[PDB]
């Protein structure tokens, strides 16, 4: 009996578990949840997540949220090679660059992907000034990621990690709009997107958001 | 032998580091970073945290940082009972609530504890409706908190773990303003933080932060 990846596949909180399964092999049932109704509000749901939020991922008596708490436990069942926790020194980089996402990346992406996207279609405009600010903000962040990859392959060095998978949700998003030309001017980013990209789970997940939302 | 943990005891992260660190027994100095000459952007650090941030870990030649990544170090290292690996149920159970504080309590207490204390140190002022309006969002994230340690002894379990001692820091901070009170409302996390007040190792970052009474 598979897994049950709860909330909408627009999100790309969710987009980043099912990215993690998906590469994992993991045995995953996306099930949606009604905002509209406040399922997500319920009783219900209040056992996969007791704040009321998605995603989650029951398995068997397991509720599991958080985004990334979530997308661990693909890995550590399923490749454990993405976590390298066979070694203090590997999984040190690895939760490094986990970390780097949370609260340098997504944290500036974020800002321009709800101004672009989140905002119109809620009916308030663009706002530019924000948009600007992170823009920068991300440009910075972008820096970093240049010597990081200018250097090392990947992420956490030179292996696929829970790290690099991680990044795409949010990234196609960005691709999503065509502000995602500043990935292409720092060349090793790019490139290392794009390995992602040409990896099939990014391409499931690539067009499981690209359809509806 | 020896680790080095950078930056200002005053930041909070810093002070989520180093406690970590006390409770898995480390071998750690904390080396000053200081803002106001700028040690963080300095050509040094940007070596030990490319960003320009405090903390950086230094083990080995080795350096991590985000303050997260940096107390999995601590536990995988020179304690492994913090993380309960090899457990995927409880293991799992873990990185959730690390989760749940990144993103549930502390982001909370962030603007709580910039309104009260960073802002006055710039500009004369608080803003008591962000004090106000995240202080709520506080109560809101209590309760589940009450849920939960009534169901469990410590967070992610009856075990301690990574999980409370992430919060150490930030709840420390919070005695420092005048909205400590809120868990009063909540005796189950009441009696949790200050069972969890009665470890040396939180009371070595109680008196690493106030001097001492
Ligand atoms: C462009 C698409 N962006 C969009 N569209 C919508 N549309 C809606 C149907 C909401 N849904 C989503 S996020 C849902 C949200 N989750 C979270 O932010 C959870 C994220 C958390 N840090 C963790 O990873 O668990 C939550 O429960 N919301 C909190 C709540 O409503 O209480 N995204
Ligand atoms: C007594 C005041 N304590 C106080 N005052 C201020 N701001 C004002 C006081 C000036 N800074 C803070 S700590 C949070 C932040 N560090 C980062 O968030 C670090 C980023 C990463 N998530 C981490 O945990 O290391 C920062 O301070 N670091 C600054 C940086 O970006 O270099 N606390």
């Not at 578990?17 to 749901?45: M, Q, R, W």
């Not at 997540?49 to 069942?77: H, T």
Request: aromatic letters at 8%; one cysteine or more.
């Amino acid at each position: 009996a598979p897994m049950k990846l709860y909330g909408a596949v627009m999100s790309w909180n969710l987009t980043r578990c099912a990215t993690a399964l998906e590469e994992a092999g993991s045995d995953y049932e996306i099930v949606p949840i009604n905002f509209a109704t406040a399922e997500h509000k319920s009783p219900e749901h209040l056992v996969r997540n007791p704040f009321g939020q998605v995603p989650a991922l029951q398995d068997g008596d397991l509720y599991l949220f958080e985004s990334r708490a979530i997308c661990k436990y693909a890995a550590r069942k399923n490749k454990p090679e993405l976590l390298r926790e066979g070694n203090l020194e590997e999984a040190a980089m690895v939760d490094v660059w986990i970390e780097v996402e949370a609260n340098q990346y997504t944290a500036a992406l974020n800002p321009i992907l709800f101004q672009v996207l989140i905002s119109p279609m809620l009916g308030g405009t663009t706002d530019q000034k924000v948009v600007d600010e992170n823009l920068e903000k991300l440009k910075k962040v972008l820096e970093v990621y240049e010597a990081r990859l200018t250097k090392c392959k990947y992420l956490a060095g030179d292996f696929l990690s829970l790290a690099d998978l991680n990044h795409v949700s949010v990234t196609l998003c960005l691709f999503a709009t065509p502000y995602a030309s500043v990935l292409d001017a720092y060349p090793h980013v790019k490139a290392w997107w794009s390995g992602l990209m040409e990896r099939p789970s990014v391409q499931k997940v690539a067009a499981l958001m690209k359809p509806s939302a």
